[PDB]
Amino acid sequence: MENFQKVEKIGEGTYGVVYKARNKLTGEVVALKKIRLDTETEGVPSTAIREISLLKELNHPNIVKLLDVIHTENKLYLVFEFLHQDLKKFMDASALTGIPLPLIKSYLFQLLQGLAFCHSHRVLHRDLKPQNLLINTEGAIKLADFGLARAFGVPVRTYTHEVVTLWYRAPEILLGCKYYSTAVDIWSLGCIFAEMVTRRALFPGDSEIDQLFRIFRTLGTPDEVVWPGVTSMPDYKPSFPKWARQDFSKVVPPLDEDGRSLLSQMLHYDPNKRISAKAALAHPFFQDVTKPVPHL
Amino acid sequence: VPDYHEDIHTYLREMEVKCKPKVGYMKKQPDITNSMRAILVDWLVEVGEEYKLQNETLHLAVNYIDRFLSSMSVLRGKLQLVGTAAMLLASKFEEIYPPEVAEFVYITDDTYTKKQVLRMEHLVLKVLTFDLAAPTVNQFLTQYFLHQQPANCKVESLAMFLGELSLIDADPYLKYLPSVIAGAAFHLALYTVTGQSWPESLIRKTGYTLESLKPCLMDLHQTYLKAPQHAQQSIREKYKNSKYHGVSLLNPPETLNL
Numbered sequence: 001m002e003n004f005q006k007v008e009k010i011g012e013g014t015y016g017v018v019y020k021a022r023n024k025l026t027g028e029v030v031a032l033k034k035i036r037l038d039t040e041t042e043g044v045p046s047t048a049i050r051e052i053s054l055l056k057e058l059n060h061p062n063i064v065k066l067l068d069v070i071h072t073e074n075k076l077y078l079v080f081e082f083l084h085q086d087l088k089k090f091m092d093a094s095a096l097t098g099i100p101l102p103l104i105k106s107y108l109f110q111l112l113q114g115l116a117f118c119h120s121h122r123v124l125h126r127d128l129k130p131q132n133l134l135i136n137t138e139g140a141i142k143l144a145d146f147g148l149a150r151a152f153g154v155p156v157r158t159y160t161h162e163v164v165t166l167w168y169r170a171p172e173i174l175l176g177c178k179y180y181s182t183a184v185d186i187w188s189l190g191c192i193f194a195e196m197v198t199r200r201a202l203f204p205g206d207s208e209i210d211q212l213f214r215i216f217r218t219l220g221t222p223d224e225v226v227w228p229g230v231t232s233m234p235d236y237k238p239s240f241p242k243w244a245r246q247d248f249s250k251v252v253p254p255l256d257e258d259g260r261s262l263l264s265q266m267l268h269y270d271p272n273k274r275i276s277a278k279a280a281l282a283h284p285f286f287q288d289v290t291k292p293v294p295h296l
Numbered sequence: 297v298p299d300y301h302e303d304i305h306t307y308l309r310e311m312e313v314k315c316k317p318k319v320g321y322m323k324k325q326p327d328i329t330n331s332m333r334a335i336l337v338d339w340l341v342e343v344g345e346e347y348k349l350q351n352e353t354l355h356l357a358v359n360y361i362d363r364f365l366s367s368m369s370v371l372r373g374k375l376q377l378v379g380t381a382a383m384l385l386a387s388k389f390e391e392i393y394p395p396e397v398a399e400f401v402y403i404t405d406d407t408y409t410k411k412q413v414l415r416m417e418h419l420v421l422k423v424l425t426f427d428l429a430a431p432t433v434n435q436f437l438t439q440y441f442l443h444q445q446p447a448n449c450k451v452e453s454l455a456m457f458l459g460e461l462s463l464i465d466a467d468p469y470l471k472y473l474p475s476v477i478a479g480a481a482f483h484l485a486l487y488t489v490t491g492q493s494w495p496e497s498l499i500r501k502t503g504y505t506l507e508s509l510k511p512c513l514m515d516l517h518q519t520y521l522k523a524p525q526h527a528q529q530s531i532r533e534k535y536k537n538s539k540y541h542g543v544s545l546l547n548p549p550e551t552l553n554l
């Protein structure tokens with residue numbers, strides 16, 4: 001903690017903040033995320049317990065690297081690799097010019113790699129959103145914030161329902177399925193893929209029922225044909241308006257035929273049919289992928 | 297959705313070796329014994345029982361205890377303080393609704409202060425270097441179950457029952473990897489309930505055979521026969537409940553034909 005030179009506040013944890021800092025002796029620039037403790041309360045936050053143990057278990061070029069955990073009685077400091085910016089911010093800075101397919105393709109490709117890795121190690125991120133994705137000046141993009149993550153078993157059992165930011169939350173969670181898995185992270189990625197193209201959140205509802213309907217109006221209201229089992233889910237209602245499926249080229253018009261195929265597979269209603277990150281990596285959409293570079 | 301099953305089974309197989317505690321750490325503990333440890337897990341069983349905790353949380357807790365006691369000698373008056381923190385950490389990791397700190401102080405009828413629980417937590421996290429995602433016998437059993445044609449409520453419950461019995465006796469169970477105890481427990485569960493044996497499909501998946509499981513089967517089968525006479529009885533009581541189809545009431549085979 002002595003050998004660090006804080007550079008500038010950068011973001012906000014829920015029990016701390018994130019600061020850009022530079023290791024005085026090695027010269028390495030890092031990101032410090034301080035977690036507040038203080039005894040006589042509840043001890044170390046379970047979100048930190050999970051974040052640290054799971055993250056230590058995730059070494060991959062597309063997953064932020066946890067360099068160290070400075071553990072003190074008063075507070076707990078997480079030392080991470082540093083990255084220049086996050087995807088939302090970057091998306092805004094492009095809001096007027098747009099994100100070039102090369103970059104969109106490269107970012108999605110990488111993101112699918114980081115996720116396949118998480119899933120290969122039984123880890124559900126459960127909060128993938130543009131703010132939780134970091135990009136550096138080299139064309140790299142990575143999964144960050146493993147604060148809502150959890151180790152899962154095979155098969156899965158019922159986990160926490162209060163999960164995933166509403167805008168990137170999958171139908172099986174919104175409908176109350178008692179078992180949800182890796183497919184929920186794919187849903188998030190499909191929404192982010194869509195978002196990178198058009199530049200504005202695919203389904204920006206403001207309530208669960210509004211989020212569902214905004215989903216139903218794009219992919220159609222699901223039925224036993226398309227998704228065996230819906231009409232039986234806990235939060236399904238036969239009163240649901242029956243919307244017809246909107247042909248995919250209108251959902252993200254600037255998308256080529258490959259993009260459409262990939263996106264459609266990432267947004268499948270039935271979680272057993274929606275493409276896994278592994279399989280997605282082989283999809284034709286990436287045959288021309290490169291690691292271009294950001295626009296900063 | 298079985299696209300990651302094998303990547304995960306392989307990863308847990310690698311980890312169970314890296315997370316495994318020292319086989320003979322007890323022999324080196326100056327103050328505590330296996331007997332005292334047995335009393336500790338037995339107690340954690342009913343504690344997990346009183347609070348409706350996952351069985352997965354019980355197994356984690358025991359893994360943390362054995363790993364902590366692998367590098368730290370503890371006085372008999374502190375064994376319970378370690379087991380309490382280990383249980384609290386397991387719940388913070390595995391539970392959706394982990395009972396709060398006060399519950400954990402309370403269950404010790406104030407044998408320790410909230411302060412002591414919190415500090416032990418901090419200490420245990422350090423000794424384990426925050427490596428809490430350990431593989432357990434429960435994680436393997438749950439996987440071996442998918443190889444049952446068709447599912448068998450009683451077999452599963454009996455397999456879990458046997459797996460849990462192994463948490464209680466460091467000797468001989470600390471000398472087997474969780475994936476192996478799981479195989480023995482599943483076979484013995486299966487055989488007892490249906491007459492069937494370790495599936496052809498599991499040899500392919502795990503690489504284990506009756507022959508490789510035999511050393512463990514022998515022990516587990518023995519623990520099973522002597523279960524009614526064991527000083528610790530919280531697992532048996534537990535598995536009499538309908539939630540587990542009263543399998544702990546079933547009669548264990550005279551022999552296994554091996």
Ligand SMILES: O=C1Nc2ccc(S(=O)(=O)O)cc2/C1=C1/Nc2ccccc2C1=O
Nearest residue numbers: 011031064080081082083084085086144145
């Ligand atoms: O460089 C970094 N390293 C990390 C590591 C971990 C996180 S976390 O999402 O708070 O876990 C965030 C960050 C991080 C960040 N770097 C930046 C740069 C500009 C704007 C926002 C962020 C940011 O969140």
